[PDB]
Every structure is written in structure tokens, then in C-alpha cells.
Write an enzyme that holds these catalytic residues in place. Structure first.
Site, mmCIF file in Angstrom:
data_model
loop_
_atom_site.group_PDB
_atom_site.id
_atom_site.type_symbol
_atom_site.label_atom_id
_atom_site.label_comp_id
_atom_site.label_asym_id
_atom_site.label_seq_id
_atom_site.Cartn_x
_atom_site.Cartn_y
_atom_site.Cartn_z
ATOM 1 N N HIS A 223 0.850 -1.189 0.000
ATOM 2 C CA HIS A 223 0.000 0.000 0.000
ATOM 3 C C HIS A 223 0.892 1.248 0.000
ATOM 4 C CE1 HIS A 223 -3.546 2.452 1.544
ATOM 5 N NE2 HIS A 223 -2.542 3.179 1.998
ATOM 6 N N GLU A 224 1.903 1.262 0.861
ATOM 7 C CA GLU A 224 2.791 2.420 0.912
ATOM 8 C C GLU A 224 3.626 2.542 -0.361
ATOM 9 O OE1 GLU A 224 2.376 4.745 3.041
ATOM 10 O OE2 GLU A 224 0.911 3.500 4.082
ATOM 11 N N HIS A 227 1.629 4.339 -2.920
ATOM 12 C CA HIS A 227 1.663 5.778 -2.700
ATOM 13 C C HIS A 227 3.003 6.290 -3.227
ATOM 14 C CE1 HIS A 227 -1.917 6.545 -0.364
ATOM 15 N NE2 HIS A 227 -1.559 5.766 0.641
ATOM 16 N N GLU A 262 -6.053 8.182 -1.072
ATOM 17 C CA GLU A 262 -6.178 6.919 -0.340
ATOM 18 C C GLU A 262 -7.178 5.987 -1.026
ATOM 19 O OE1 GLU A 262 -4.439 5.680 1.890
ATOM 20 O OE2 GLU A 262 -3.353 7.362 2.744
HETATM 21 ZN ZN LIG Z 1 -2.507 5.205 2.513
#
Ligand SMILES: [Zn+2]
Lengths: 423, 4
Positions: A223-224, A227, A262
Site C-alpha cells: 500500500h505504501e 503511494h 487513499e
Molecule cells: Zn494510505
């Protein structure tokens, strides 16, 4: 074949190349910290992050009458050599788990190719690197050498569970949103994970559930990294662009908002909360940013430094942004190629898709409520593997996500704090 | 970020 060619030990002697004491461009002063280069353009600093933000150098937990809801403090975490050794091995294991999947291989390749743009020049006739997208490595002779990098995995700051991408800004340029990109520092820990609930009505309710299932840390890191990918290609969505949650009464009664960045990152049905109009707005916006990068490259005539040739750097960015080069040699952005790259980075690389590849149980939406935080140890193969995570094949943990079931596989989880009812 |  592995993503990380060497199995580093925290105590391995520094060599000034891939094991070295370094300093980061935090615009301040700091003592050098021991870091490890696990792959081209990727480093790991097994230290609590008291560096990217000088105003966050205190790991000490405030009085009991100050700690909010979803947060966990332990000023002693990651202070010993054994912990740093385990941290390094844990992070490397997760990179291998991610890389072992086609999606993770694609994401990591995009990340390595995502070199931050050389836009620190004051004159448009020359290209220059932006120093905050570099770290200073102490060489064997004690001198410092500037090395460009794309990603740094570092320990969490005071709040251990506040994982996030941090990067140094520019005086004028919004590097994570102008197509340029910037070195990403991911606050992350492989030593803890979070509990979620298997029933959607329970997981999205702040008053129910204790956190029966544990999130696979590989998904959390992925997930990071997603990003990070957005930020390295300078296409992250401004945090002021949010979704006024109206699909969850508990979020609503608190006027809670969630950034589009997000929702995009989680993907799946969550990504649908960003309407077509606003989505097209962003696409066009970043298309224009890539256009400017193409033009800035055309205006360049000389390069600053001797690390590489001007034509070499023009080529690395041609590959990063998938630009087109006409007969005259001028660069331009092709709509088809842009849409394909933009889509890859925003729709293909999503948390929801990684869950499909890892074949693990995971929150079904970003719009839920945390249940608990657990201490874990994924380093021992008897606990977690690159191939199956916690759900070890040919064992009682292989089926039905039994390995992530904290009640069945209780020996692998120690609940440190319950969040339910504290919202 | 993990969110709430
Ligand atoms: Zn996030």
C-alpha cells in the site's frame, strides 16, 4: 533472481557502498545512521524516524490523558541491534514476497525506473539534480559522496503504527504533484500488524469486533509502495481533494473525510467514489505536467555534474515518462502512452489487486475501523514465508486463511492494544 | 497511510 541479492546482517561491517553510515537532506543536523542498500535506488534505515521531520524527534509517549484512538507508543522499539537486524530481515522478506508476484514485480520495476526528475536548475538550458533526492554516503576515506535514490524504508516515528510516505519538499515546486517526483521515505515496521474483522458489517462498525484476522504486512507495505509510486511520478492527488464519506453513518456523524489519494490507492469499489469528472480533471492536469517535463528536457543543452552525460539522463527520463522522440530529437508526450502509464500507476497498482495476488484475507474497504495492533515476527520461516505469508502450505494454516486467524495461529500474534470502542 |  531475488530482489535483494544479499541477506544483510545489521552487524555486517560498513563498506561505504551498500552498507554505510549516511546523512539525509533534512535541512538540519544529524549524526550519521547505518543504512543498507538492498537494491538499485532503494535503501533501508533500521532506525526510528526522528530525521525527516526535526519537529518529530521525540519518541516518548505523552501522559495517558493525551493518547488518542488509533495510535501506539513505545519509545524503546527498534533501539537495539537485534531489533534492527530483525527489522532489516523483515523488510527484505516483504520486498521478496511482493517481488515474487507479477504485480509486485511490475510495481517495483516502475519504482526503480521512477528516478526523481532533474529539475533543480535555475537556468532552463541545463539540467541539474535536486539535492533533496539524494543522501550523503560516508566513503571509506571518511568523505561524503552524494547518491541519488528513489526510496528509503525507515522505522516509524513516535506513533509506531502511523505508517506513511514522507518526502522533502521544494521551495516552489510541488514535486509529488508536478510530475517531477521526489525520493520517498516510507515510515514502516514489519514487526507489528493490524487486526480486522471478516464480516463487513462488523469491520465497518467502530463498536464491534476485537480483530480476529491479521493483515498480512506485505499488503501494508505494498500500500505504501503504491503511494510511493504515485509520488515518484509526481501524480499524487492533492490531500485537499477528499471524499465526504456518506456511505458510513459512523464516519458521517463525525464528518470524517478520506482523501482521494487513499481511495485510489486502495482501489476496488473505493476508487469509484472519485467521480468521472474529477478523475478526468486530474488526468488532464498530470498530462500537462508531463508535457512541461518534455519541454524542459528539450530546452536543456548542458548537464550539471559529471555523474552522467546529458544524453544519458535525457534517456532515463524518456524511459521513466515513456516520452516520444521525433526526427528532430525533440520530446513530446503521447496521449496513449500517458494514459497507459497513468492507469498502470493508479488502477493496476492498488491494495485490492495485491490482495488478489497474495491470496490473503484483507479489509474489503478503506472505509472501516481499526480493531487492534499485534506484535509479530515474520523473520522465522516457521512463522511466515515469502511464498505464503502466514498461511503456510501443507500445514493446518494453509487453508481458510488460518495463518491470519489470530485465534487459530495465536502463537504468532500478541495483542498490544484494542481499538474498538475507543473512537 | 492506513487510515482509521
Ligand atoms: Zn494510505
Amino acid at each position: 533472481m531475488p530482489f535483494v541479492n544479499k541477506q544483510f546482517n545489521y552487524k555486517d561491517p560498513v563498506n561505504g557502498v551498500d552498507i554505510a553510515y549516511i546523512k539525509i537532506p533534512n535541512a538540519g543536523q544529524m549524526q550519521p545512521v547505518k543504512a543498507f542498500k538492498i537494491h538499485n535506488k532503494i535503501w533501508v534505515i533500521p532506525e526510528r524516524d526522528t530525521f525527516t521531520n526535526p519537529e518529530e524527534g521525540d519518541l516518548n509517549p505523552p501522559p495517558e490523558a493525551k493518547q488518542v484512538p488509533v495510535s501506539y507508543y513505545d519509545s524503546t522499539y527498534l533501539s537495539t541491534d537485534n531489533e534492527k537486524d530483525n527489522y532489516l530481515k523483515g523488510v527484505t522478506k516483504l520486498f521478496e514476497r511482493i517481488y515474487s508476484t507479477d504485480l509486485g514485480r511490475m510495481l517495483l520495476t516502475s519504482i526503480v525506473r521512477g528516478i526523481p526528475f532533474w529539475g533543480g536548475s535555475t537556468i532552463d538550458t541545463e539540467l541539474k539534480v535536486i539535492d533533496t533526492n539524494c543522501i550523503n554516503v560516508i566513503q571509506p576515506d571518511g568523505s561524503y559522496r552524494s547518491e541519488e535514490l528513489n526510496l528509503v524504508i525507515i522505522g516509524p516515528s513516535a506513533d509506531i503504527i502511523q505508517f506513511e510516505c514522507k518526502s522533502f519538499g521544494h521551495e516552489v515546486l510541488n514535486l509529488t504533484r508536478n510530475g517531477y517526483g521526489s525520493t520517498q521515505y516510507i515510515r514502516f515496521s514489519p514487526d507489528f500488524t493490524f487486526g480486522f474483522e471478516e464480516s463487513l458489517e462488523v469491520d465497518t462498525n467502530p463498536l464491534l469486533g476485537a480483530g480476529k484476522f491479521a493483515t498480512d504486512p506485505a499488503v501494508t507495505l505494498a500500500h505504501e509502495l503504491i503511494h510511493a509510486g504515485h509520488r515518484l511520478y509526481g501524480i499524487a492527488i492533492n490531500p485537499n481533494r477528499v471524499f465526504k464519506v456518506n456511505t458510513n453513518a459512523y464516519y458521517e456523524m463525525s464528518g470524517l473525510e478520506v482523501s482521494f489519494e487513499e481511495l485510489r490507492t486502495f482501489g476496488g469499489h473505493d476508487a469509484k467514489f472519485i467521480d468521472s469528472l474529477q478523475e478526468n480533471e486530474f488526468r488532464l492536469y498530470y498530462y500537462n505536467k508531463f508535457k512541461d517535463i518534455a519541454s524542459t528536457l528539450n530546452k536543456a543543452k548542458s548537464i550539471v555534474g559529471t555523474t552522467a552525460s546529458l544524453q544519458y539522463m535525457k534517456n532515463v527520463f524518456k524511459e521513466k515518462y515513456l516520452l516520444s522522440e521525433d526526427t528532430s530529437g525533440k520530446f513530446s508526450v503521447d496521449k496513449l502512452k500517458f494514459d497507459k502509464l497513468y492507469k498502470m500507476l493508479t488502477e493496476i497498482y492498488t491494495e485490492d489487486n495485491f490482495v488478489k495476488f497474495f491470496k490473503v484475507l484483507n479489509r474489503k474497504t478503506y472505509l472501516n475501523f481499526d480493531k487492534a495492533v499485534f506484535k509479530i515476527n515474520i523473520v522465522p520461516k516457521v512463522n511466515y514465508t515469502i511464498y505464503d505469508g502466514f498461511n503456510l502450505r501443507n500445514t493446518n494454516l494453509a487453508a481458510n486463511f488460518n495463518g491470519q486467524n489470530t485465534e487459530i495461529n495465536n502463537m504468532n500474534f500478541t495483542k498490544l492494544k484494542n481499538f474498538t470502542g475507543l473512537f | 497511510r492506513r487510515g482509521i
